[PDB]
Amino acid sequence: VGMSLLALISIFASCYMLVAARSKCLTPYALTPGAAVPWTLGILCCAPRAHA
């Protein structure tokens, strides 16, 4: 139980930190009337699938 609990904590921390890095990289493009830069769009998926 201890090992399983620690593994789950570690995997959740890694996933949350990945999503946070995504958001902090892609947030400045929500503050300009600018494009999404398809190169970065492909690697870092965004909630807008088609619009903007």
Partner: protein, 161 residues
């Protein structure tokens, strides 16, 4: 002409924010996105505009939203070009020198944050955040725009109005 047209823009494109019945800040409609400084807290004085979900950026002190379709046409128009010269503001004229915005009078007040600086043709260039009392003058901590990136300029000693 210019003053009247800018006042028309402001009436159709600026909304107050209420907190505890007192005015706190203003939100402007630029391009296609509702703009509002993050440090200003309250609710936008509009039923339609309150229900929108805002995206935060505490590093840029800015909260943005995608405007709904039926206020899309009542919004100003934007640009990114900042040549040297003079520009407008709801409290007079503003001076752009050395990458800095200066107020002639020190007429800034608390609760004045978030009112845009206009261009000569009526375009929006920047969003005022705060003022640093520069002796007789007043430098502006303002949110300027690059070609595609928001950049925040903050002189020493600015206070969040």
């Amino acid at each position: 002409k210019r003053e009247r047209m800018c006042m028309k823009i402001e009436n159709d494109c600026i909304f107050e924010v209420k907190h505890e019945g007192k005015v706190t800040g203003y939100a402007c409609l630029v391009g296609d996105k509702v703009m509002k400084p993050a440090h200003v807290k309250g609710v936008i004085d509009n039923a339609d505009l309150a229900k929108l979900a805002f995206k935060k950026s505490s590093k840029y002190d800015l909260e943005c939203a995608q405007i709904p379709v039926h206020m899309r046409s009542d919004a100003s128009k934007y640009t990114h070009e900042k040549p040297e010269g003079h520009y407008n503001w709801h409290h007079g004229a503003v001076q752009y020198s050395g990458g800095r915005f200066t107020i002639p009078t020190g007429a800034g007040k608390p609760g004045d944050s978030g009112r845009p600086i206009f261009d000569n043709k009526g375009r929006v260039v920047a969003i005022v955040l705060g003022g640093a009392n520069e002796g007789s003058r007043t430098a502006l901590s303002v949110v300027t725009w690059n070609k595609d990136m928001v950049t925040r300029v903050t002189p020493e000693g600015s206070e969040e109005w």
